[PDB]
Amino acid sequence: VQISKKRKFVADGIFKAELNEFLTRELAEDGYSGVEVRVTPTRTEIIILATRTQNVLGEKGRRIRELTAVVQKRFGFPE
Amino acid sequence: GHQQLYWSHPRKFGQGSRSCRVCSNRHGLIRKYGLNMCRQCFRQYAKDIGFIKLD
Amino acid sequence: RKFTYRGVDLDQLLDMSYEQLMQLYSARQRRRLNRGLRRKQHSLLKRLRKAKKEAPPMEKPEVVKTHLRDMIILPEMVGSMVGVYNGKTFNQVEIKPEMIGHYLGEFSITYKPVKHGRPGIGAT
Amino acid sequence: IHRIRITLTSRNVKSLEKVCADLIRGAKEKNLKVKGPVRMPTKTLRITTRKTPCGEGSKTWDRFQMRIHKRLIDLHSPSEIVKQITSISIEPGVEVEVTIA
Amino acid sequence: MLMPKKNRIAIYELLFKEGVMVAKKDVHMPKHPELADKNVPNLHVMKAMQSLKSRGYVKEQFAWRHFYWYLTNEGIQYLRDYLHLPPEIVPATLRRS
Amino acid sequence: KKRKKKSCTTPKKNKHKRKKVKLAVLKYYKVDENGKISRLRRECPSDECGAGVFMASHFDRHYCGKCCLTYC
RNA sequence: GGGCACCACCAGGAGUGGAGCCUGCGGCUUAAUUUGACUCAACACGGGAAACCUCACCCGGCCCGGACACGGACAGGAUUGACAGAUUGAUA
RNA sequence: AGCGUGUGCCUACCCUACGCCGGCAGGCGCGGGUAACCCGUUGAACCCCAUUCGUGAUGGGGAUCGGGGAUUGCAAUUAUUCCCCAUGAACGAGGAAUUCCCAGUAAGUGCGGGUCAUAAGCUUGCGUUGAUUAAGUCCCUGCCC
Ligand SMILES: [Mg+2]
Ligand SMILES: [Mg+2]
Ligand SMILES: [Mg+2]
Ligand SMILES: [Mg+2]
Ligand SMILES: [Mg+2]
Ligand SMILES: [Mg+2]
Ligand SMILES: [Mg+2]
Ligand SMILES: [Mg+2]
Ligand SMILES: [Mg+2]
Ligand SMILES: [Mg+2]
Ligand SMILES: [Mg+2]
Ligand SMILES: [Mg+2]
Ligand SMILES: [Mg+2]
Ligand SMILES: [Mg+2]
Ligand SMILES: [Mg+2]
Ligand SMILES: [Mg+2]
Ligand SMILES: [Mg+2]
Ligand SMILES: [Mg+2]
Ligand SMILES: [Mg+2]
Ligand SMILES: [Mg+2]
Ligand SMILES: [Mg+2]
Ligand SMILES: [Mg+2]
Ligand SMILES: [Mg+2]
Ligand SMILES: [Zn+2]
Ligand SMILES: [Zn+2]
Numbered sequence A: 001v002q003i004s005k006k007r008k009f010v011a012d013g014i015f016k017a018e019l020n021e022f023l024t025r026e027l028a029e030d031g032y033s034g035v036e037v038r039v040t041p042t043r044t045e046i047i048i049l050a051t052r053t054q055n056v057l058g059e060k061g062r063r064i065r066e067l068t069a070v071v072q073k074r075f076g077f078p079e
Numbered sequence B: 001g002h003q004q005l006y007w008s009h010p011r012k013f014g015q016g017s018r019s020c021r022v023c024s025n026r027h028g029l030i031r032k033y034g035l036n037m038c039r040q041c042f043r044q045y046a047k048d049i050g051f052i053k054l055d
Numbered sequence C: 001r002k003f004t005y006r007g008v009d010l011d012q013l014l015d016m017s018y019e020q021l022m023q024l025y026s027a028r029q030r031r032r033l034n035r036g037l038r039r040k041q042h043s044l045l046k047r048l049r050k051a052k053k054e055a056p057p058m059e060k061p062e063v064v065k066t067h068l069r070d071m072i073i074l075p076e077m078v079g080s081m082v083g084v085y086n087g088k089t090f091n092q093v094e095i096k097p098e099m100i101g102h103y104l105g106e107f108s109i110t111y112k113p114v115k116h117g118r119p120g121i122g123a124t
Numbered sequence D: 001i002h003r004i005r006i007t008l009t010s011r012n013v014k015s016l017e018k019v020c021a022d023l024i025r026g027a028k029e030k031n032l033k034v035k036g037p038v039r040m041p042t043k044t045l046r047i048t049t050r051k052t053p054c055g056e057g058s059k060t061w062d063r064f065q066m067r068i069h070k071r072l073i074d075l076h077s078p079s080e081i082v083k084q085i086t087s088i089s090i091e092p093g094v095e096v097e098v099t100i101a
Numbered sequence E: 001m002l003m004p005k006k007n008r009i010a011i012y013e014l015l016f017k018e019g020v021m022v023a024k025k026d027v028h029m030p031k032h033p034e035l036a037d038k039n040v041p042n043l044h045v046m047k048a049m050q051s052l053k054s055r056g057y058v059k060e061q062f063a064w065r066h067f068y069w070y071l072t073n074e075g076i077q078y079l080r081d082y083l084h085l086p087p088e089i090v091p092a093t094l095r096r097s
Numbered sequence F: 001k002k003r004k005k006k007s008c009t010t011p012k013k014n015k016h017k018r019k020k021v022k023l024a025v026l027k028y029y030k031v032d033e034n035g036k037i038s039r040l041r042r043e044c045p046s047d048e049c050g051a052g053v054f055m056a057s058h059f060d061r062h063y064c065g066k067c068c069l070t071y072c
Numbered sequence G: 001g002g003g004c005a006c007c008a009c010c011a012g013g014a015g016u017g018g019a020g021c022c023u024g025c026g027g028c029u030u031a032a033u034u035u036g037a038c039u040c041a042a043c044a045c046g047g048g049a050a051a052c053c054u055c056a057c058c059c060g061g062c063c064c065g066g067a068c069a070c071g072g073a074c075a076g077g078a079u080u081g082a083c084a085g086a087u088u089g090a091u092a
Numbered sequence H: 001a002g003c004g005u006g007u008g009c010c011u012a013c014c015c016u017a018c019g020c021c022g023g024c025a026g027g028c029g030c031g032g033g034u035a036a037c038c039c040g041u042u043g044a045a046c047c048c049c050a051u052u053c054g055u056g057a058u059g060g061g062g063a064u065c066g067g068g069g070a071u072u073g074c075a076a077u078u079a080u081u082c083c084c085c086a087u088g089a090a091c092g093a094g095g096a097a098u099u100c101c102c103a104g105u106a107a108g109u110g111c112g113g114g115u116c117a118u119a120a121g122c123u124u125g126c127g128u129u130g131a132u133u134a135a136g137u138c139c140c141u142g143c144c145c
Helices: A005-030 A053-057 A059-075 B039-049 C010-015 C018-024 C027-035 C039-053 D013-029 D079-088 E005-018 E042-054 E073-083
Strands: A032-039 A044-050 C064-066 C081-085 C090-094 D002-010 D034-039 D043-050 D061-077 D094-100 E020-023 E058-063 E066-071 F029-031 F037-039 F056-058 F061-063
Touching: A005 A032, A005 A044, A005 A053, A005 A059, A005 B039, A005 D043, A005 D061, A005 E058, A044 A053, A053 A059, A059 E020, A059 E066, B039 D043, C018 C027, C039 C064, D002 D013, D002 D079, D013 D034, D013 D061, D013 D079, D013 D094, D061 D079, D079 D094, E005 E020, E005 E042, E005 E066, E005 E073, E020 E042, E042 E058, E042 E066, E066 E073
Parallel strands: C064 C081
Antiparallel strands: A032 A044, C081 C090, D002 D061, D002 D094, D034 D061, D043 D061, E020 E066, E058 E066, F029 F037, F056 F061
16 A cells, blocks of 8 residues: 555655764764755665765775665665 | 563553654654654754744 | 342352353453453462362361452352452452452452541641 | 646645646647646644743743645646656656556 | 574674674564574674674664664674685675676 | 662572583493493484484473473 | 833723632652642643553562673583473463 | 544554444444545534423532443453443532733634543634723833833
8 A cells, every 4th residue: 555645745754854863973074964865766866965075985985885785774675 | 481471561552662763762752644753852853854833 | 148149049150151150240240251361360260279179178278379459259269268469468358259240459458548647837 | 648647746836836837838848738737735734842841931832834735737648758758857855646547 | 692503693694795784772573674584583683783893893873773783894804704704705895886 | 869778588599500410411321231222211202302302201201301292 | 200011000801719520739648659840930730641561669570681801611511491290479 | 614634664553434233332244535536515512493491409510329231451440431220419609819811802612633552621723603891001010211
């Protein structure tokens, strides 16, 4: 089945709030500024705004490759 | 044995079956629209969720 | 003079099954019996029956202690000694035939009756 | 040729009306038949809470409010043209659902 | 903490395969969602990850109710030596795909 | 408020200490001079406890400690 | 000496203070009757309508969910769980 | 009439039309709704039109108790709630003192949301009926220049 529009919008807001809190705690050291979620039926893209992107990316892109993993593990939507 | 007794009390309804999704507190809980937050956490995260004060 | 429960004496009550006793009871006891008894109540009944079997022919049975204050008094319990927990102590109660249909907790009080003293300074 | 309904749900009206206008213009540029946009009644979710984290002081209340707006568009057309016009329609904040009745 | 060795083996295999771990902080959850058909309680995962953290093998974060764990280089070496894995195996994180 | 101690109960409820038995394998088998082996303890009829999982020779029953199977 | 205000008055309306009851706060009882707050700016307030949970109080009984480091002991076994009878409120 | 809610990650617990059974609380079937779509044209209460009563603590009032029945729950006793017979207390407008209010307002009257397995004498909103008095002052109270 499906849920109503009210529940859908409240769920989207709660997901954005939790994502912002997790990203804040994780990337405070890197000057994390904000998060922007653009939902597309193909993929859901997440843009991270921070002062320096070198620390967020990590070496060879390791750290960001970690983050996109745990997010997928946390909220459960498919790989 | 202990395996049977531990956590045996049913928790399918009541205040003991519900808690805040942010701080795990069971008092002052908001269940409308499936928010499942206590009032303080909701007041902290309302702008992020999308509730605006117009009046 | 002889005891009767809704026109039925003790012997017929002891012969009856639970379905027959459901119609004699009130709405609450009937609903409770319809929902059934769990393992702990059956264990208490078994212990009471075992204790009553071993009593000497002229003596009372040994007291059986329990926390089950919501237990319904069945006609098979008449004549048994039950210690009922009130939260602090086990109070000894002998089951009489006129207790049929009540709970065990109705016969072990959970508080001390109030005897009042002189009101304090904070009372006006 | 299918009867296709597009349902647009949004939280702000400016973006929603911009997307609706874009869809209408795009469809009518292909010489198609469009009905709408028909506007459903606005939904208003309300949460009234106490301001104080404790139970001290004057009893003051916060009244938080969320508004949801909904639009409908009807199109008599094959599926391919609808997806053609829809691909551009992607906008941040607007949920677009396409169904074939 | 006392637990069957196969539970530890499964937890460590999952951690080294993925490189990260997520838990809900629920000691009463009957089984971990990720570790299904292997019958690993969530408590075992929490305590094993805590033991790994105390030794510096994993780095930890906590968010809103959840535990997040990332694998460290010395943790990678420890897991590789523990599971007797060939030196040609790396977690999925270390592959820039 | 401050916590009161009130430390007085039954003196000490002791924890069970498991018996130390030296070479418990030996008493399961009896040996003749010819070199034969006879299994003194019965083998449980269950699936898992079939060959090496012996029962318990209690004074009035047989008890398998791995699956709680009991016989007279 | 001036200015203002129905959380001031004036002209009024509905009242409350009196009765029964419901709910909070003191007292007094209790094994415990958990606790915060005491003029406006405490007292149907803590979103506090508690059968269990909630629970923070009282009576009794299990559990470790005491990471990690060092030492001891240990495949001639470090330790784990459990049937029956006894025991227990209890099939802890 | 109007504002609103409705099948829920964990999480078990939704709103209900119609047919039959029961006197009632309720019980059985069988459908719709993830909602301007179904409940729902939300047949609300006060109000209106007739009937009985007749200044009598009265057919005003409904506290306290007895005996039965049913629902929620693992569990209802110190009565969860609900229904039926019976019982029928104070109360005949309230001392000193004191609260709120200037127009669709005060008051009367119901209906939603929160709490909610069970659930409103509280709170937060919504309609419906609908006024008397005033367009001033610094006397009381209080705050500023
Ligand atoms: Mg006056
Ligand atoms: Mg009145
Ligand atoms: Mg009065
Ligand atoms: Mg009064
Ligand atoms: Mg007071
Ligand atoms: Mg306390
Ligand atoms: Mg003031
Ligand atoms: Mg209080
Ligand atoms: Mg209650
Ligand atoms: Mg009880
Ligand atoms: Mg209990
Ligand atoms: Mg309690
Ligand atoms: Mg241990
Ligand atoms: Mg009368
Ligand atoms: Mg009368
Ligand atoms: Mg009765
Ligand atoms: Mg009491
Ligand atoms: Mg009556
Ligand atoms: Mg005043
Ligand atoms: Mg109301
Ligand atoms: Mg309600
Ligand atoms: Mg209240
Ligand atoms: Mg003055
Ligand atoms: Zn919270
Ligand atoms: Zn066996």
